[PDB]
Design a binder for this molecule. Structure first.
Ligand SMILES: CCOC(=O)NCc1ccccc1
Ligand SMILES: CCOC(=O)NCc1ccccc1
Lengths: 265, 264
């Protein structure tokens, strides 16, 4: 992959693999989500991140995900090439945004888009805090300074407030735990695993007769390597919508909330 | 990916991804095993399986893995390229073999090698019958006919009988369930998941101080979507382990094997 001409965005091509696809022989939303992170990390490397600015490293600070939002119009087939463009933007003192555009390599038509909100956190204490002006200065030179949104629309679904699922839940999947393959290189649960866990409460019948169109996922706390998770779904609706809650079963601590939206094939 | 000049093997180059590596920033054996299955699939397509031969699809037969054996000398780093070459061979009417060699694309030096044993089964009934001369002969024209072995050496790890762990196990990890990411395009649990399930009972202190050099794994029976799996490990010894996968209730064996780890 590579930096565009202006050096303010990054593109990479991916061939969809046999094991990356579901029962339709098209890419799963967990697969899309892993390619979104691979191309993110490849952009980070390309602009010099050995992913922390100098001020970040001196204050033991990191980017962490507060929200992921993914809209898929077509899931690429087994053997197909998808093209993903990525870029970041400063959201002033609040945090940063990474956005993505997925294309069919052959047609050049937009097949997907995704937006994400990141906040600063102390790695040691886990305390959230503001982007300082020193840090802003530092990474603002890798970012288009005029707006560039994957989701421009005036009331797009990617910014909506998400409520807490009320007990009892219409569906549930109980006693979910990560294995070593769920962990990243820093031994934290991969952010994509949460997507998988949220979807495990969707009944097989919805998955067999529908196509996932939108997923909006808030991150509240992390699951540790020795935590166990309960996944809770309630239908809220030709389009099926759901509301989602992930919580630790060792006391019911909220770890993620979310909404999905599915159209019949 | 592409067939070699003679049309009798397939090579492919893979760039190791961020999420495919563990705490030392080199590929997991699960990443390696996923890459082996992708080059295998890509080879099947290249020689005209758009994987079932004629008379195979007529008597509802499929290839299923009996054994996977993997030896790693160096796990590729994050952003490195592993070049894997793969090829099949006839093992008479017993079954079929698929072999792999991995190399550092910049050095050309071998970094791993993998062998796998495959038998026929119906697919509706799942009865493990053997290779006829229609479910054969049709696939020999894609195989080197003279022997070509990732593991040539007589008396060698990859062919050894594995025994059954005796209760009580030294370590265990209980209540393992596959989620939808664990299923393939036929909604069967992907064979790579059992590898993950077997290593889950190796204690973290071992993973933190050693590197896995060898994994031998037998496949006895499939784990279904609503099955629950228990993973059991005992040191036999470098460290050596004996492994057993069994279904959480009745104690139905699904997998047995052994691993071998060198201190870093
Ligand atoms: C800098 C690399 O980070 C990403 O691109 N992250 C992608 C992602 C975020 C949230 C949930 C799942 C995936
Ligand atoms: C024909 C395509 O299948 C493969 O090559 N699969 C490779 C594999 C086998 C057993 C366990 C893990 C991986």
């Amino acid at each position: 992959g590579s930096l565009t001409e202006d050096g303010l965005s990054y593109k990479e091509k991916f061939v969809v693999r046999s094991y990356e696809v579901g029962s339709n022989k098209t890419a799963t939303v967990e697969t899309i989500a892993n390619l979104l992170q691979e191309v993110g990390c490849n952009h980070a490397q390309s602009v010099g991140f050995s992913a922390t600015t100098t001020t970040m490293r001196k204050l033991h600070l990191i980017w962490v995900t507060a929200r992921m939002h993914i809209e898929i119009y077509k899931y690429p087939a087994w053997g197909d090439v998808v093209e993903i463009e990525t870029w970041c933007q400063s959201e002033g003192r609040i945090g940063t945004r990474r956005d993505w555009i997925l294309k069919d390599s052959v047609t050049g038509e937009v097949t997907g888009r995704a937006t994400s909100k990141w906040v600063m956190m102390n790695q040691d204490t886990r305390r959230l805090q503001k982007v300082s002006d020193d840090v802003r200065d530092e990474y603002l030179v890798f970012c288009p300074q005029e707006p560039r949104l994957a989701f421009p629309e005036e009331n797009n679904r990617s910014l909506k407030k998400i409520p807490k699922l009320e007990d009892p839940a219409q569906y549930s999947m109980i006693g979910l735990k990560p294995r070593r393959a769920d962990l990243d290189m820093n031994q934290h649960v991969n952010n994509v695993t949460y997507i998988g866990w949220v979807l495990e409460s969707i009944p097989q019948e919805i998955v067999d007769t529908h196509e996932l169109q939108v997923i909006t996922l808030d991150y509240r706390r992390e699951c540790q390597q020795d935590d166990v998770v309960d996944s809770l779904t309630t239908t809220t609706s030709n389009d099926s919508q759901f509301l989602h809650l992930l919580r630790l079963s060792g006391d019911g601590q909220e770890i993620n909330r979310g909404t999905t939206l599915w159209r019949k094939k």
